[PDB]
Design a protein around this nucleic acid. Structure first.
Length: 170
DNA sequence: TAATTAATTAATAATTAATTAATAATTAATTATAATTAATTAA
């Protein structure tokens, strides 16, 4: 009746390019999945929607993309995932890199330099250091890299069971 | 030279939503106006 898996991704990039079949395929294993498309903006952080499901989730599974560092909502939301995780280690994180190196995520260089080149003219000089401290630790856990040739279909089946193995056996 | 980082300066789309901007028309229904022809009646 509650949520056992909570996703997070980019808007226009992978909303109907891959994360869609992965969300659907998952519903065939009899588990309730949460994905959201509402652009929020109704304020700066909504409570009964995101904040509710965050504490209700069980396996936070982000999906870092190529342009995941531009949307002003995603990063500061990810800062709430990995922060809540460090307080109670009962839950886990299974990131999935996508079309990007597992090196442009630990130092925000490469395809993110342009992103933080303009993000530093608006916000505080400490809030940005809060993101780069949280975004870094995500790029150290285990994760299926998806190269240019790997099957966008076989990976889904392999990763889904790893989410279903931690539920049946508990 | 290429390459990128670093500081600064610089220039049309697209919807979101507020509002105003088109009588037009047809349907439903309302009142008003002219004569002609026919018969009868009075020079």
């Amino acid at each position: 009746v509650e949520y056992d898996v909570f996703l997070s991704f980019r808007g226009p990039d992978t909303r109907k390019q891959f994360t869609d079949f992965l969300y659907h395929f998952l519903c065939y294993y009899k588990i309730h999945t949460f994905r959201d498309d509402d652009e929020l903006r109704k304020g700066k952080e909504i409570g009964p929607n995101l904040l509710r499901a965050i504490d209700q989730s069980k396996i936070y599974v982000p999906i870092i993309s190529s342009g995941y560092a531009d949307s002003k909502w995603c990063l500061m939301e990810l800062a709430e995932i990995v922060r809540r995780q460090e307080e109670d280690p009962r839950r886990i994180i299974l990131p999935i890199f996508y079309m990007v190196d597992p090196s442009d995520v630990r130092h925000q260089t490469g395809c993110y330099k342009k992103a933080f080149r303009k993000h530093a003219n608006k916000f505080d000089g400490q809030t940005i250091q809060n993101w780069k401290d949280a975004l870094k630790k995500v790029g150290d856990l285990k994760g299926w890299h998806i190269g240019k040739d790997d099957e966008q279909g076989a990976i889904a089946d392999k990763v889904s069971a790893d989410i279903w193995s931690h539920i049946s056996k508990e």
